[PDB]
Amino acid sequence: GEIIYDGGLSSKLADVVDKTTEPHNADGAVKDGRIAPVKLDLEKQKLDKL
């Protein structure tokens, strides 16, 4: 017989990144107008620039 329903394109609720991500603000449907998080070089084991 004629095929009425044979699978199809399936929507996914969420995607999951398999790579480690740097901290970030929202850049999707919600866009954050504030400055991106500031990355500071702290907790240095050996002395430098002092």
């Binding site: 929202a26 919600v30 866009k31 954050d32 107008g33 504030r34």
Partner: protein
């Protein structure tokens, strides 16, 4: 100087299904990105100026849509039919397609005449021309408010002279 706007900036569009069962009227005023975490009022100020330029109300203006009309062929009908806004013929075409889907008879002559005469221009007591057209709600509200604001600075010549008589030197 003053700008004479010839046409009313309606923003209406007509979307209808292929079978004609469903039809809708949508007012397209654009899409404006909004950022969270900061004040919305300050962002709305930037978009207000851009919106005003789109509607053509940023600079002082007076509407000049009085002459945009035509007269029907019938001898009884002496009304002036406005050409601004969404065309009543577009709604009539959309409505007839809807009736075709439901197998209802098409719009009669009496019903057609009432629909085709919805958009009109008529004079008022003060000599101004009033245009009744199909247009978006926010487009109508913003455009008419800007009209009242610019009209505050439009005065008769004799009123202007009386305000500047004391500064005119004798020589």
């Amino acid at each position: 100087e003053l700008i004479k706007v010839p046409t009313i900036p309606h923003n209406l569009v007509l979307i209808q299904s292929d079978n004609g069962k469903h039809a809708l009227i949508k007012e397209d005023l654009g899409q404006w990105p909004v950022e969270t975490g900061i004040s919305l009022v300050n962002q709305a100020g930037v978009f207000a100026v851009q919106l005003a330029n789109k509607l053509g109300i940023d600079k002082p203006f007076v509407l000049d849509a009085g002459s945009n009309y035509f007269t029907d062929t019938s001898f009884i009908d002496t009304r002036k039919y406005c050409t601004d806004g969404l065309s009543p013929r577009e709604i009539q075409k959309a409505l007839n397609r809807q009736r075709a889907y439901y197998d209802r008879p098409e719009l009669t002559i009496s019903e057609n005449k009432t629909l085709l005469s919805q958009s009109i221009i008529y004079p008022d007591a003060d000599g101004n021309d009033v245009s009744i057209i199909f247009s978006g709600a926010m487009s109508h509200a913003i455009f008419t408010y800007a009209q009242s604001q610019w009209n505050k600075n439009i005065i008769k010549l004799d009123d202007y002279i009386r305000e500047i008589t004391l500064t005119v030197p004798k020589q």
